[PDB]
Coordinates of C-alpha atoms and ligand atoms in Angstrom, one line a residue:
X1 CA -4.7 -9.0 -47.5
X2 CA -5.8 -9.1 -51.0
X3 CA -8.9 -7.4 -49.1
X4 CA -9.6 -4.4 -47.2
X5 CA -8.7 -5.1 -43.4
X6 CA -11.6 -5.9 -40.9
X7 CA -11.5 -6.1 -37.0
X8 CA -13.3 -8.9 -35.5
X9 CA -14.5 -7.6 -32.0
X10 CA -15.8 -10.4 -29.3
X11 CA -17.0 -10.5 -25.6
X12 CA -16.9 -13.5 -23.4
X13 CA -21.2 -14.8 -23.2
X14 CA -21.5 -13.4 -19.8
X15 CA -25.6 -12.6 -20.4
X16 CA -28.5 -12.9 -22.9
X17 CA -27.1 -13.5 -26.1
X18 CA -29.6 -10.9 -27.6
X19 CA -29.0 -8.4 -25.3
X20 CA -24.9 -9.0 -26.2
X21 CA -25.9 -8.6 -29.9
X22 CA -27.4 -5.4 -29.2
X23 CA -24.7 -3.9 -27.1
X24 CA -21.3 -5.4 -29.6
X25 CA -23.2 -4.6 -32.9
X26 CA -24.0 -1.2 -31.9
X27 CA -20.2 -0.8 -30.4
X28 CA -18.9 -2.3 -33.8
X29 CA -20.4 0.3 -35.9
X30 CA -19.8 3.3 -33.4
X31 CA -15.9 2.0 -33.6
X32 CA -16.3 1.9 -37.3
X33 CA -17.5 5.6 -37.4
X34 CA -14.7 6.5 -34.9
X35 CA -12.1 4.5 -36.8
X36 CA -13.2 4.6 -40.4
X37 CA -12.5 0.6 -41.0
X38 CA -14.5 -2.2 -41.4
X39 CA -15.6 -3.5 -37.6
X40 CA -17.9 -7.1 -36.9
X41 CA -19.2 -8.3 -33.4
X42 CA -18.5 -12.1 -33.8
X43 CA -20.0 -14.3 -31.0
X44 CA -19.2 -17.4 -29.4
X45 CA -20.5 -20.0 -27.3
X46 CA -19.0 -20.0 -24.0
X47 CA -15.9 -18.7 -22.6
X48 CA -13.1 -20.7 -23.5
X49 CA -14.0 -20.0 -27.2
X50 CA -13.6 -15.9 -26.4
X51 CA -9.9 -17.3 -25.2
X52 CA -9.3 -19.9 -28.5
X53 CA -10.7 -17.6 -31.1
X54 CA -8.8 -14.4 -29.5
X55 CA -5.5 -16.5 -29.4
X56 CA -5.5 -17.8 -33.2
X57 CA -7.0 -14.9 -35.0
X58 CA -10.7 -15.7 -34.9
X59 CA -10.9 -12.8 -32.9
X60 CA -8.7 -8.9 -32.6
X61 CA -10.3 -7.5 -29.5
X62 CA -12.1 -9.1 -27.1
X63 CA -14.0 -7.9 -24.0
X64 CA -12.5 -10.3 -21.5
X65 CA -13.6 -11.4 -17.8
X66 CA -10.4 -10.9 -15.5
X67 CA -9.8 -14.5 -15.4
X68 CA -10.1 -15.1 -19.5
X69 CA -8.3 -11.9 -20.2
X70 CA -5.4 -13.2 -18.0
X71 CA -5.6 -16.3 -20.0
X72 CA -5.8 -15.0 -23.8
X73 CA -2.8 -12.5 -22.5
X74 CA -0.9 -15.8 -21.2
X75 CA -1.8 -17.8 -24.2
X76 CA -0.7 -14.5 -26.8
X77 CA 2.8 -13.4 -26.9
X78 CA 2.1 -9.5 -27.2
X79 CA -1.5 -8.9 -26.5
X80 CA -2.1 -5.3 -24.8
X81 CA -4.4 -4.5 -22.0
X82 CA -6.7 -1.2 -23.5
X83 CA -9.1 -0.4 -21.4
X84 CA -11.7 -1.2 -18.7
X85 CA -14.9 0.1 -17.1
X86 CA -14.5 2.6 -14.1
X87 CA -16.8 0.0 -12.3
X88 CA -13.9 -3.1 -13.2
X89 CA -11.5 -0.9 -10.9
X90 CA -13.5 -2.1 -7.8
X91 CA -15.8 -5.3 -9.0
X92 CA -17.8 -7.8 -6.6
X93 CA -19.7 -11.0 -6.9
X94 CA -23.3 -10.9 -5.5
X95 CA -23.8 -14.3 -3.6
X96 CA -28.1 -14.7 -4.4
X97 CA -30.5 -16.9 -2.4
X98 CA -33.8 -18.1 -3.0
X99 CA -36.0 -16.7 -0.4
X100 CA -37.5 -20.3 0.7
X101 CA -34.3 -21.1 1.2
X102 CA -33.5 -20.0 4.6
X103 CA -30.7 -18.6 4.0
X104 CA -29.9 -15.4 6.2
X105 CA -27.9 -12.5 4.8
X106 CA -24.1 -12.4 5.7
X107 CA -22.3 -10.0 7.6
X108 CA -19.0 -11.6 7.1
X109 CA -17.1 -14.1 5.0
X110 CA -17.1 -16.7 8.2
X111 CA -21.0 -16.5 7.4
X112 CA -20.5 -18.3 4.5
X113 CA -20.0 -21.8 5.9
X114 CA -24.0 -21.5 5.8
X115 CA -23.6 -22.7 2.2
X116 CA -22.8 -26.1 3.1
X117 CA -25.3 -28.6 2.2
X118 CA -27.3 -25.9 -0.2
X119 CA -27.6 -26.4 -4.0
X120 CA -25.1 -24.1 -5.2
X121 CA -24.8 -22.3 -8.4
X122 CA -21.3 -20.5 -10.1
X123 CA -21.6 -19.2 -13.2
X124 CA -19.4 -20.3 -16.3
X125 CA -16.7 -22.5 -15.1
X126 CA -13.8 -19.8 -16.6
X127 CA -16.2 -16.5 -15.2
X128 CA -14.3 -14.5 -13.0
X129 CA -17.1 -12.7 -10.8
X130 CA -19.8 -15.8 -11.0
X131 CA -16.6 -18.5 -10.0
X132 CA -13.2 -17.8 -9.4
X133 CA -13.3 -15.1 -7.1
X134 CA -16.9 -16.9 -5.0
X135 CA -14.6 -20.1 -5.2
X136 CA -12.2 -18.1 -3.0
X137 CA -14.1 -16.3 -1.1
X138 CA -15.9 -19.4 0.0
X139 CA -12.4 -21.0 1.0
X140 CA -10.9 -18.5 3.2
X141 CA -14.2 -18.9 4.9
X142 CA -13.4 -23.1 5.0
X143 CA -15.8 -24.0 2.7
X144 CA -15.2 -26.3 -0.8
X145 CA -17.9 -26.9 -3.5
X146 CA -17.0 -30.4 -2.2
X147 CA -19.4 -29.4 0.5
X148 CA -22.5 -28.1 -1.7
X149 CA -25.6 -30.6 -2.3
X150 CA -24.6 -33.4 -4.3
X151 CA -20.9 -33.2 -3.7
X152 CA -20.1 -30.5 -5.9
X153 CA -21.6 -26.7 -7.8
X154 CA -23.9 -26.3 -10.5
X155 CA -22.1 -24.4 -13.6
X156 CA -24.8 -21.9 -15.1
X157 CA -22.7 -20.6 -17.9
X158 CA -23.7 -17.0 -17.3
X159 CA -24.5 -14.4 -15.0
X160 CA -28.0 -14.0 -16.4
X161 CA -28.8 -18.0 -16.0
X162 CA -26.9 -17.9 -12.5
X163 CA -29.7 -15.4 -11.4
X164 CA -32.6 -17.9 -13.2
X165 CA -32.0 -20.8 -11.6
X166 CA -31.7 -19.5 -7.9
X167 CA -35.2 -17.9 -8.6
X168 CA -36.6 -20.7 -10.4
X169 CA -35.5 -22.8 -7.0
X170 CA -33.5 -25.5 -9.0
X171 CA -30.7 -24.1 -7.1
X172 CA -31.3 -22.7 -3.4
X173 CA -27.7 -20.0 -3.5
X174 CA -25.3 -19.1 -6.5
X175 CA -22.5 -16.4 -7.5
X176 CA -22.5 -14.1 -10.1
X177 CA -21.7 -9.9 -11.3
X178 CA -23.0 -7.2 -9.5
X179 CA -23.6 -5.0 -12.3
X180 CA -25.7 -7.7 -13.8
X181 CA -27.5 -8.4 -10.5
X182 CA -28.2 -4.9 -10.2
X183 CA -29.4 -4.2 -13.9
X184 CA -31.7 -6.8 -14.0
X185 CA -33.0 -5.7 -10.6
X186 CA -33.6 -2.1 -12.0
X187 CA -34.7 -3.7 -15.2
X188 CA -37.5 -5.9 -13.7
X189 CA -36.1 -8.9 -15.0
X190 CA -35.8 -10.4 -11.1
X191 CA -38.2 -11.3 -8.8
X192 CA -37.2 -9.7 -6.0
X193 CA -40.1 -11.3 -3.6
X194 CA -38.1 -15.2 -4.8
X195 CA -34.3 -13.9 -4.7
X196 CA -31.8 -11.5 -2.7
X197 CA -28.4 -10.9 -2.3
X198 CA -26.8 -12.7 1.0
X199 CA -23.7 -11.4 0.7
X200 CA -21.3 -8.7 -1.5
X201 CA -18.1 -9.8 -1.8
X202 CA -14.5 -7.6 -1.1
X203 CA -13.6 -5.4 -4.5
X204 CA -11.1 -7.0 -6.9
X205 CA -10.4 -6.2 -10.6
X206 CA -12.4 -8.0 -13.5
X207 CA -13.5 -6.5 -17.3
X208 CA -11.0 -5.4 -19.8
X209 CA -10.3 -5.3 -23.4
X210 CA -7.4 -6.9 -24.3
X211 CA -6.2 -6.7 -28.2
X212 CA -4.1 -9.0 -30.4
X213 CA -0.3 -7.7 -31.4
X214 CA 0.3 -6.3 -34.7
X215 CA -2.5 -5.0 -35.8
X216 CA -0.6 -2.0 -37.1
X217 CA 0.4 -4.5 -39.5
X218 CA -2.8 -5.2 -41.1
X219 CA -4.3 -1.6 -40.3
X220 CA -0.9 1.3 -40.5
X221 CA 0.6 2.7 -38.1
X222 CA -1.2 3.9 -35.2
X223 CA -4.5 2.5 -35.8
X224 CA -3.9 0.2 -32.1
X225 CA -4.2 3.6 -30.4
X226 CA -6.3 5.1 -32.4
X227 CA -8.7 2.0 -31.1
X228 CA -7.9 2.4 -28.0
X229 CA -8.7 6.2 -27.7
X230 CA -11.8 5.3 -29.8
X231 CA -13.1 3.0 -26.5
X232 CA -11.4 5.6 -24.2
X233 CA -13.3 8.5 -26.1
X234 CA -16.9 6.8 -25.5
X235 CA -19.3 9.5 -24.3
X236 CA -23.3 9.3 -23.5
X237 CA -23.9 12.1 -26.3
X238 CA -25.7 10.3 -29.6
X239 CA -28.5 7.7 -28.8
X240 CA -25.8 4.8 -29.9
X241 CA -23.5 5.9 -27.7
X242 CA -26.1 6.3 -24.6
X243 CA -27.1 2.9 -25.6
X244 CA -23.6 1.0 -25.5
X245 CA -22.8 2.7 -22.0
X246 CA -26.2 2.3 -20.5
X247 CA -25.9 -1.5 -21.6
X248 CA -22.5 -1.5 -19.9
X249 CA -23.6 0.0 -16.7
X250 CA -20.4 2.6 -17.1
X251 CA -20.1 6.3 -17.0
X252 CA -16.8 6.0 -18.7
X253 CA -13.8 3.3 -20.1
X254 CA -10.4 4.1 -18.2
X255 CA -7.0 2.8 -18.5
X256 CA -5.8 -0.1 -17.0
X257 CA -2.9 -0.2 -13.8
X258 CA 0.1 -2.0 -15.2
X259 CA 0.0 -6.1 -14.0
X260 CA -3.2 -4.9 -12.1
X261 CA -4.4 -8.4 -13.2
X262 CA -1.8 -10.2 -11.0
X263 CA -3.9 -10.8 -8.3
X264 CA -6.8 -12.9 -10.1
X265 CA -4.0 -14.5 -12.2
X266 CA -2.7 -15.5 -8.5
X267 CA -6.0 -16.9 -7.6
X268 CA -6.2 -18.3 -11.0
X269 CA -3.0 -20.7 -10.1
X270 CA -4.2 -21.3 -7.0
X271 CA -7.8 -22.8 -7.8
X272 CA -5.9 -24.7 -10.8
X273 CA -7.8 -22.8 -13.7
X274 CA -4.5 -21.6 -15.3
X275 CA -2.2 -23.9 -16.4
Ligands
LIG1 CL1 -16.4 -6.9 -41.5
LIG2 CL1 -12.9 -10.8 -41.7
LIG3 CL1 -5.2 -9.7 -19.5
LIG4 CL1 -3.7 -20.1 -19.4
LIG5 CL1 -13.9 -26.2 -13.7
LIG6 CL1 -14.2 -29.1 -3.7
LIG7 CL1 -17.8 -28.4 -8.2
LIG8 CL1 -25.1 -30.1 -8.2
LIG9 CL1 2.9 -3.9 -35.7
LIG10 CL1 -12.4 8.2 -31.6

């Protein structure tokens, strides 16, 4: 580059777009203390656009949903796996319901053929704990969104609308994060009198950061784990730091298990969502 080097950080639009501007422009500058290069949060609009601009160069690290980061890392010969949440070791989907709607919690996946017939709510079509991994859940129990009223699921686009339109009653049920479920509940942000949780699913695998190859290249040598360490080393010690981790719900990032991701990629291929 004719110009200094600067490292375009994006998330996937899982929540309130000025809640995500908070929590990615604080990151960018705390990795841009840590790193001492130039670092921007660029947003997009929905999840495939976290996987297009990621795969071209819009984007050089991304916080990915399991299902998208499978997809950028399909899509990108030599994109790495950095780094996830402790909580993304052992992630569930909270199935919601509006409490006129009838609907009784569930005390096993069986329960689920209770959906049928319900106005039904997944998240974005690409999310990974508000569709995917309810979409297969809900089959091992029998059920299709085939089955839902109107012959088919709403699409929310995010966890946070996922939660307002079971509460608003537009939609009776829906799918989405627990940490988001469970930060808005602390946060007063649900009314817990109009929705509550029916059902936690089994644990499976979700967040990560994934990072585009050869950015060594552009930065010198080392600079890819130096970033890496930089997540790694996050700590709740200044206010910014407090901040980014209390908006992430974590204690900590970790390392990732090598092919961890297999699994949802399997599910991926089986529900059609990967090519
Ligand atoms: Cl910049
Ligand atoms: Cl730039
Ligand atoms: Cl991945
Ligand atoms: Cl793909
Ligand atoms: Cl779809
Ligand atoms: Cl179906
Ligand atoms: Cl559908
Ligand atoms: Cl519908
Ligand atoms: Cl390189
Ligand atoms: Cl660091």
């Amino acid at each position: 580059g004719p110009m200094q080097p600067r490292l375009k950080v994006g998330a996937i639009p899982d929540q309130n777009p000025e809640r995500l501007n908070r929590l990615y422009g604080q990151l960018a500058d705390e990795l841009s203390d840590r790193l001492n290069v130039k670092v921007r949060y660029v947003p997009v609009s929905n999840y495939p656009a976290a996987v297009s601009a990621f795969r071209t160069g819009g984007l050089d690290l991304v916080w990915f949903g399991g299902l998208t980061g499978v997809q950028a890392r399909l899509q990108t010969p030599g994109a790495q796996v950095l780094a996830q949440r402790d909580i993304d070791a052992r992630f569930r989907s909270v199935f919601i319901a509006n409490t006129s709607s009838g609907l009784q919690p569930i005390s096993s996946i069986n329960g689920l053929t209770s959906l049928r017939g319900k106005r039904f709510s997944f998240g974005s079509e690409s999310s990974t704990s508000g569709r995917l991994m309810p979409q297969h859940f809900l089959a091992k129990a029998g059920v299709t969104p085939s089955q839902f009223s109107g012959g088919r699921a709403g699409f929310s686009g995010s966890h946070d609308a996922t939660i307002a339109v079971v509460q608003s009653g537009a939609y009776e049920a829906g799918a989405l994060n627990e940490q988001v479920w469970t930060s808005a509940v602390n946060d007063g942000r649900v009314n817990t009198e109009k929705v509550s949780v029916i059902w936690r699913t089994p644990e499976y695998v979700d967040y990560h950061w994934v990072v585009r190859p050869k950015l060594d290249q552009r930065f010198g040598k080392g600079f890819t784990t130096r970033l890496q360490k930089a997540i790694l080393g996050l700590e709740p010690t200044t206010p910014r730091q407090v901040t980014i981790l209390e908006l992430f719900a974590a204690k900590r990032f970790i390392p990732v298990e090598a092919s961890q991701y297999k699994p949802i990629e399997k599910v991926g291929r089986e529900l059609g969502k990967i090519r």
